[PDB]
């Protein structure tokens, strides 16, 4: 079916299992104990095993985090080294 | 105080100006004509000029475009190459 989707299992169990795997990035998507319905992402990284809430927006799309800005300026700067277009490498550069 | 803000200049005027510039990336921010109140980004690129809508979210943040997925599958594979931590470099690796 899916080697990474162990459905509903305890956060502890996961933490237990992952702490064994011998590689950073070892993960699995389980069903949250706390907030039902929502899935969580457990991953091993070093001497720990972190979790990430699998967020969903209005539209239903999935995502772990996205990049938004507090000011036009913060947006601009960011986009001097990260494309403004989603299908073309376009980086902002001063006029001039 | 800001060399890239051109207040309320016609979209056409922007193009005109920007098209003269010599570097892919030249740009300016203006008050959308077609949207009294919103800001738009004009960036010179290739023989033409592209325009972007500076969007705002329910929290009133600024952004141009984000990365979200229609399926958990998509989200995972994507995160094999892209960190899942906005503060740490962690890439998904299958379990053993
Ligand atoms: C948030 As959790 C650990 O219950 O998936």
UniProtKB/Swiss-Prot annotation, chains A, B:
Changing residue 67 to P: Strong loss of clustering of phospho-LAT at the T-cell plasma membrane. This is Growth factor receptor-bound protein 2. The gene is GRB2. The modification N6-acetyllysine is found at residue 53. It is found in: Nucleus; Cytoplasm; Endosome; Golgi apparatus. There is a cross-link at residue 53 (Glycyl lysine isopeptide (Lys-Gly) (interchain with G-Cter in ubiquitin)). Belongs to the GRB2/sem-5/DRK family. Changing residue 34 to N: No effect on the interaction with SOS1. Changing residue 53 to R: Loss of polyubiquitination. It comes from the Eukaryota.
């Amino acid at each position: 079916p899916h080697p990474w989707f162990f459905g509903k299992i305890p956060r502890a169990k996961a933490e237990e299992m992952l702490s064994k795997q011998r590689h950073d990035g070892a993960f699995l998507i389980r069903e949250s104990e706390s907030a039902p319905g929502d899935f969580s992402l457990s991953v091993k990284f070093g001497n720990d095993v972190q979790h990430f809430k699998v967020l969903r927006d209005g539209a239903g799309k999935y995502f772990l985090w996205v990049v938004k800005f507090n000011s036009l300026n913060e947006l601009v700067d960011y986009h001097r080294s990260t494309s403004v277009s989603r299908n073309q490498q376009i980086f902002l550069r001063d006029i001039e």
